[PDB]
Design a protein around this ligand. Sequence first.
Ligand SMILES: CCc1cc(C(=O)O)c2c(c1)C(=O)C=C2
Length: 500
Amino acid sequence: MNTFSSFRKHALLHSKETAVKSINHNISFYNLLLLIQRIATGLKSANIKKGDRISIHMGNCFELIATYYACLKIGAVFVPLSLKLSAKEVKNLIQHSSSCAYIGDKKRFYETKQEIESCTMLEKIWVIDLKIEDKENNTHNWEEIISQPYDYSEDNIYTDEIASIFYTKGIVYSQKTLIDAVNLTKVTINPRLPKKPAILSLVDLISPWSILITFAALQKGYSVLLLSEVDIENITETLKETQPAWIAGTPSNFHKIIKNEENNNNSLDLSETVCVAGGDSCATELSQKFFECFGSHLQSSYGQTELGGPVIYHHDIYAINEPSIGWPLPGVEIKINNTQSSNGELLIRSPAKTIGIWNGHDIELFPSDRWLATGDLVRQENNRNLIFLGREKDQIKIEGYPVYPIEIENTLIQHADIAASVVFSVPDKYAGERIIALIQPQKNHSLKAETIASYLSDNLAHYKHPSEYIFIKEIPVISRRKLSNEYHLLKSQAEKVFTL
Ligand SMILES: CCc1cc(C(=O)O)c2c(c1)C(=O)C=C2
């Protein structure tokens, strides 16, 4: 069982349950399968064949998930085009990917029309809500692909065959890569037992992590809630109405949800809700601000397209007082380049092996034993939790020993008088580097400098101690490199500078 057959099995055994819903629409598992079958028939009637690449370019809608599944059913290689791409970058990917067809919605197509319609290898262009005067040549209305009943034609799909290309470099997934990537993602979707759960991903469904989440949720029998851009702009209001059991988002997504409660009397109840902050870093500081706002125990996921899917999962960030990213998922193997130290660079190999990189003309094959160098520094505890020591380019050297800003910042944020902090170093003639702490005092809370110093005496080794404190009422926009370059400016704008 491949990804489409897994969906079809659950769809046919739980046919009347809701598979996908929006605020004002819903489709059952069975009716979703019927839509998928119609699209497949339309694709094959348009002479789309196995191995043909199809660029997909649309916002969150039921047709997007059905189109993925229709591509999987007939073996058409789907190529999702991020909504963040300009018209210029969209056309480049259509050309680079050697796509011969394109499926998009009205908003994205009309932003991109000449570019799309000037890619001459595109035999078919299907647009949801295509305007009638634009039905001509190879541009078709989406209705034409579903106008014909399912023809019950068979499909021979094999696990080694290409399934999709996800551009960061076009990362090629086989059917097996997707099976294994969804299997990793399934382990990270753990809604609480309802006293039926709906899954929400705030990342666009065109983006690989949401694709995997959606497959994984449907295969577990959950419904998937799809939100529009305006729905997410009004996320607190949307959440109060839709009440999903599980929410994936960026750290920025959840920071926004926290901010909205400050100014919205009627509190949103996320206490039963399981929330997963997804990224390539650590969510420890977010998790604890997230707990005293909502009483919810934030989780995190760590992965990237080159590793197939999520590879490291923290099912309870707030339970670990040090910054940490969690535990390798099943089959995930790690290596820490920590020669002669306890801390080192995290190297990962994933059980979801991507096939290679599409370079326009050939697939650059990956030796399936290759490790990925993350650029992140870790230490592995006895229980195999990965303590997160930050971004390797951010480490500081003090008397030869490495110092990790993320670690100092996590200690600093524990103080109630500190709203936020950023630690970085500046050059120093005879010490090499000097540690600076940029401290943001909590509003109203009166400042107070040696308190920080004495606090840090009690909690970090001396060599990690900042040599200097810059008190600033707002920290600029975070890149410790840029702030280090602005060190003299920061001091001149500072409300106070304390030098030890
Ligand atoms: C599909 C590969 C993948 C991509 C991304 C991303 O945010 O780009 C993420 C993860 C996996 C993840 O586990 C949390 C964030």
